[PDB]
C-alpha cells in the first residue's frame, strides 16, 4: 500500500512515464528490487494529502515551483549526493531545488520560453528588442507582422519585464529574500516601458491572449511568437517553417525568462530513500537514462552536462538550453501564488492605459507585501479553526 | 489635461495661487509656457484618482505628509536640482522630501506649532513648563486661565509628550524604522505624567479643544495657547495683543513639534518635467518669486533661507521657523495615520483618569504597530477582492481567546 | 484607596499566605507599616483591570508568564537590587523576571517537572530515554508499566521534544526573538520522533491523559510518571513508596522541562514603592521569611543559600537540578498561541493521522500566523472597544 522493499515512482501522465519505467526495469535486472511508476489524477494534488499521513510515493516527479510547497509543509527528506557527482549536471539546476539551504530534489530536465521565428520570413531574426518597430513596419505592409505573444500573462511578458534590473525576489546564499520584491526599479520599470509603447505605438494587440495569439504564428501571419517547448507540435503540423533561438537581449543585456526544473524528490516517508538515492544517481541520471526518458516524451533541455551535448545537435533545443541559462529561476515559496496576480493585474492595467508604468508596479510591490499578509493570515484561520473543532 | 508645451498647476484654494498665477505669466513673459493653476475642491484626494491614469496637473502644491502617499504610489518624480543648489535651502525640510532615497519634491513653505500669549496679560512668557502651574494658580487671583489648548489632539500635545525623548518613527536618512516606534520610552513617559497631572492639580480642564480654546483665549480668558499659523487671523480679528513665540521647554528639552512643509511635486507621467525644473528651480523659489506667493495669502515661513530672513523680521514667523528646527518632520509614511489615531486614545483615557501615563503609552503600541498592517491590509483585501467543505467563515471577525 | 501608605499584596489562595502574612509582622515591627496579604479570585484576571485603573495590591505574586502580559502592558515597576545582592540567587532565575532588558520581578519559587517514580519497582532510576522501550519489556512481564504521563498535553511531553534543539522562541539577548521558533529543527523532531515511535510501539497508550497517568501511578501500577511539586500530596496520601530525581536525557543530552517561577512584582502604578524592595530583598528574601511562607504552603524550590535547608529533602533537591537544565517558560504574547499549535502537532502525531516533521512544521506555520493574527486581532479589539465606549459617552452623556 505504501511502503518499503521497492520503489514506486510519480510521475505526471504526460511524461516520458513509459521510457522511466523502461529505466526502472534495468533497476530491477540489477538490483532485483521493483520499480512501480504511477500517474493519478491530480497527482500533484493528491500528494500533501497522503505524505501528512506519511504515504504514497518514495519519489515525486515535478516542477521544482511546487515542492517549496512540499519542502516547507515538511514532505521531502534533504538529500544528500557527493560534490563530484552535483558536478554532473549544471550550476544553476541545483539552485532550483534548494530550500533553506537543503537540497531536496534531483533536477531532471529545464523548462523555459525561447524566440520562434518564421523562417521563411526572418532570415535570421532580431539580435535585440530595439529595432522590433522596425522590423514590424517591413512586414505590416505585406499583411503580416513583426511579432505576437500573450499579454495577458507575466509569464509570457516578464523575460522582456526582467532583462534590464528587475527580479523577483533575492536568491542569496541558498536563502530567498521576500522583503526585496525586484518589481519597482529602473530595470523592470524602463522593462515595461518599452513594451507599452509598442502596444500604444501599434506593434502589438492588448487583448492578444495565448490562443489567439499561438494560432497566429502559423499561419504565418506573425512573423515572431515567444513561447516554450511545450508548443513545438502545434507548429510541426502547420509544415510552416520555423527555426529557434536566444531570446532578443534588451538594452545590451540578455532577457531573463522563468526556469521550471523538472526535479524528483524523495519522500519522507520513503523508508527507501537509499534505493531511491541509487535509482536516481546510477541509472535514472546516467545518459542511457535519459536516453530512455527523453525518447518517450521529449524533455527540453536536461539537467546533466554529460546527456545535453548529445540532444544539443539540435538547434531547437541549444536555445532552450541557452535561454535557460541567461534565464531567472523560478521561486518556489508561498508568496510566489500571491506575487503572480499583483503582476498578472499591474501589466493588465499598464496595456490598457488604466495607469502607467511607474504606477502599476508600486501597485504590485507594496500591495504583494500586504496581500501576502492576507494569504498567510488566511492560513491560520483555516488551521486554527479547523482544529479547534 | 496636457499636454506637453505648457504647465497646469494644482494648488490649495486656500493658498496664495494669485501670487503663484503671478509667475504664471511672468514666467510665460520669458519662455513663452502659458501656465494656469488651479484650486480644484478635493485635489489632494482628486489628485491620485487622476495622476494614477496619466494625468493630473503637471505639478503639484501639498504638505510633505501626503506626498509619502504619492511618492510610494510611484506618481512623483525623482528630481535632481543641480547641484549645490540644495544649499540655497534649509538643510531639514530636504528630509521631508525624501523617500528612501528618492528626493521627491521641492519644500516651499514651513508650518508648525507655537505658543502664542497674551502680550497684554501675561508681558513676558514662560520658556519652560513646570513655571506653568505656578502661572495658573498667580493669574487665578484675577479669575483667568493660563495656558488653555487642544488637549483633545495628540497634534497639539504631542510637542509636549514628546518633549523629553519621545518619537513618531526613527528617522535618519530617507527611511524610518517602522517598527521601532516611541511612544514606548521614558522620554514620553514622564512627558504626558506632566500634562496629565496639570489637569488633576485642577491647572487646566479635560474638555479643552479648539473651540472653547479659541473662545477662551480671544476674549482674554486665559494668558497663553499653542497654535500654528492658521490660528493668526482670528486673535487679530478677536482685538487682542498677541504675540507668538517658541514652545516652552519641558525636563530641560526643547518641545518636538510636528514640522509639516508644504512641498511642490511633479507628476511622473507628465510629458514636460524639465519646465517644472525651471518654473520651480528658476523661478518660484526666488525672493520675488515666493514673495509674491507669500503676499497673496503668507505661506507661513518658508523653507527658502533667503526670503526667510526677509519674513524673520516678523517674530511671530521667525518662532514658527524656530519651533520647526526644533521639532520632527512630520513622517509622511502611510502607517502614520495608524500612529495618529492609537495615541488619541493614549492620552485621553490617561487624561481622564481612567488610566496612568505607563498604561496608555505603552498600549499605544498596540494601537499603532497592528492597526498599521490593518489599515494597508484592510486596504489590500478590497483592491485584491474588489477588481478581481467550503470553507471555514470569513471575519472581518476572526476567533477568540480559549 | 489604592494604598496611600499600607501594604496590599495579592498572593494566589493556594501559596504560602498565613505564613507570607507573618512576614508582614516583623516588616511592620520595626518599620510601622501596615502589610495586608488578601487571596482575592482570579487575580490574574482581577489585577490588570484595577491595574489600569491605578489599582488593586502594592505587590503581586504570581509566575512570571502572566507577568509577561502585565509588564508588556506597563503595568510593573522596574526594580533594581544591587550586584552585591544580585549575586544572591541563582543566575538562571533572573533570566524569567527581565522584559526587554529591563528586570521586572523578584523570584521565589521554581515549579519544574521530575522524574517522580516508584522505589518499590525501580529502585534504580533510569538515566536514558533510549532503555526505556527494553525496560517495558523486562515491566510487562511483572504485570505493570515503565512509564506514564499526559499525552495530550504539551507542558510534560515538550521535555523530551525540546530535548535535542528543540526550543520555542529563540532566547539570545535578555529578549526572546519571536520569529526564532524552533519547533521544526531537527533535533525536536527526533525528539518527537522518538515519543512517536514509544507510542506506536505500543509502550505508551495514546490516550493517556493526567488521571490515567498519575492514577495509574499512586494506584501503583506503573513504575514511573512525569509530574511536579504539585502531584507529591497524594503519592504521599496512598502511601506509595515514591523518590523523585533528574528526568532521563536522550543522545547524552538531557531532558529540557519548562521552568515556572512563582514571582513577586510591583505595580507600577504602587504608591508604596519604596517599602515593597525593603520588605522584600531585606525582611521576605530572607531564609526565616521563605521559611514562614513554606511553612504554611510549601513553596518547592529560590535564594540560593536557603535552598539548602530545603535541598536537604532529595524531592526538592531534584526539582532544582531538573529545572537547572531546563528550559524558562517565556513570558510575551506569543507564547500561548505556541501552545496550541504545539499541541495540534503531539496530539495527531500520536495518532499517526499526521506525520511526522510534518505536524511539525505546520506548527510552526500555525505559530508564525496564531502569533500575528493574535496581535492585530487584540488590537482590533482593543480599538472597537475604546472607539465603542467613546461613543457610549459621547452619546450617553451628550443627549441631554
Ligand atoms: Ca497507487
Ligand atoms: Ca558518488
Ligand atoms: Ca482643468
Ligand atoms: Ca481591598
Ligand atoms: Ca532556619
Ligand atoms: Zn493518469
Ligand atoms: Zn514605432
Ligand atoms: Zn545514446
Ligand atoms: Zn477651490
Ligand atoms: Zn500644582
Ligand atoms: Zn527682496
Ligand atoms: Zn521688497
Ligand atoms: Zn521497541
Given at each position: 500500500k505504501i511502503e518499503e522493499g521497492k520503489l514506486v515512482i510519480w510521475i505526471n501522465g504526460d511524461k516520458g512515464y513509459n521510457g522511466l519505467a523502461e529505466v526502472g526495469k534495468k533497476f530491477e535486472k540489477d538490483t532485483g528490487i521493483k520499480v512501480?511508476?504511477?500517474?493519478?489524477?491530480?497527482?500533484?494534488?493528491?500528494?500533501?494529502?497522503?505524505?501528512?499521513?506519511?504515504?504514497?510515493?518514495?519519489?515525486?516527479?515535478?516542477?521544482?515551483?511546487?515542492?517549496?510547497?512540499?519542502?516547507?509543509?515538511?514532505?521531502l527528506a534533504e538529500i544528500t549526493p557527493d560534490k563530484a557527482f552535483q558536478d554532473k549536471l549544471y550550476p544553476?539546476?541545483?539552485?532550483?531545488?534548494?530550500?533553506?539551504?537543503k537540497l531536496i530534489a534531483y533536477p531532471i530536465a529545464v523548462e523555459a520560453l525561447s524566440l520562434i521565428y518564421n523562417k521563411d520570413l526572418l532570415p535570421n531574426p532580431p539580435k535585440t528588442w530595439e529595432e522590433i518597430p522596425a522590423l514590424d513596419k517591413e512586414l505590416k505592409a505585406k499583411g503580416k507582422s513583426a511579432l505576437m505573444f500573450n499579454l495577458?500573462?507575466?509569464?509570457?511578458?516578464?523575460?522582456?519585464?526582467?532583462?534590464?534590473?528587475?527580479?523577483?525576489?533575492?536568491?542569496?546564499?541558498?536563502?530567498?529574500?521576500?522583503?526585496?520584491?525586484?518589481?519597482?526599479?529602473?530595470?523592470?520599470?524602463?522593462?515595461?516601458?518599452?513594451?507599452?509603447?509598442?502596444?500604444?505605438?501599434?506593434?502589438?494587440?492588448?487583448?492578444?491572449?495565448?490562443?489567439?495569439?499561438?494560432?497566429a504564428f502559423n499561419k504565418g501571419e506573425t512573423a515572431m511568437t515567444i513561447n516554450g517547448p511545450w508548443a513545438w507540435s502545434n507548429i510541426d503540423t502547420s509544415k510552416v517553417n520555423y527555426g529557434v533561438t536566444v531570446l532578443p537581449t534588451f538594452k545590451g543585456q540578455p532577457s531573463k525568462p522563468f526556469v521550471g526544473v523538472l526535479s524528483a524528490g524523495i519522500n519522507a516517508a520513503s523508508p527507501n530513500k537509499e534505493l531511491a538515492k541509487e535509482f536516481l544517481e546510477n541509472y535514472l541520471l546516467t545518459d542511457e537514462g535519459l536516453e530512455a526518458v527523453n525518447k518517450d516524451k521529449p524533455l527540453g533541455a536536461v539537467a546533466l552536462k554529460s546527456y545535453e551535448e548529445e540532444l544539443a545537435?539540435?538547434?531547437?533545443?541549444?536555445?532552450?538550453?541557452?535561454?535557460?541559462?541567461?534565464?531567472?529561476?523560478?521561486?518556489?515559496?508561498?508568496?510566489?501564488?500571491?506575487?503572480?496576480?499583483?503582476?498578472?493585474?499591474?501589466?493588465?492595467?499598464?496595456?490598457?492605459?488604466?495607469?502607467?508604468?511607474?504606477?502599476?508596479?508600486?501597485?504590485?510591490?507594496?500591495?504583494?507585501?500586504?496581500?501576502?499578509?492576507?494569504?498567510?493570515?488566511?492560513?491560520?484561520?483555516?488551521?486554527l479553526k479547523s482544529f479547534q473543532q
Open positions: 512501480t511508476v504511477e500517474h493519478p489524477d491530480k497527482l500533484e494534488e493528491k500528494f500533501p494529502q497522503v505524505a501528512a499521513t506519511g504515504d504514497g510515493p518514495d519519489i515525486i516527479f515535478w516542477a521544482h515551483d511546487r515542492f517549496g510547497g512540499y519542502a516547507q509543509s515538511g514532505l544553476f539546476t541545483w539552485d532550483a531545488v534548494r530550500y533553506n539551504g495577458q500573462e507575466p509569464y509570457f511578458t516578464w523575460p522582456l519585464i526582467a532583462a534590464d534590473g528587475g527580479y523577483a525576489f533575492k536568491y542569496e546564499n541558498g536563502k530567498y529574500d521576500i522583503k526585496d520584491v525586484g518589481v519597482d526599479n529602473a530595470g523592470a520599470k524602463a522593462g515595461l516601458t518599452f513594451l507599452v509603447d509598442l502596444i500604444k505605438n501599434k506593434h502589438m494587440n492588448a487583448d492578444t491572449d495565448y490562443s489567439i495569439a499561438e494560432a545537435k539540435d538547434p531547437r533545443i541549444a536555445a532552450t538550453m541557452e535561454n535557460a541559462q541567461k534565464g531567472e529561476i523560478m521561486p518556489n515559496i508561498p508568496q510566489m501564488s500571491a506575487f503572480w496576480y499583483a503582476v498578472r493585474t499591474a501589466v493588465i492595467n499598464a496595456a490598457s492605459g488604466r495607469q502607467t508604468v511607474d504606477a502599476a508596479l508600486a501597485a504590485a510591490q507594496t500591495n504583494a507585501a500586504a496581500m501576502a499578509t492576507l494569504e498567510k493570515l488566511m492560513k491560520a484561520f483555516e488551521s
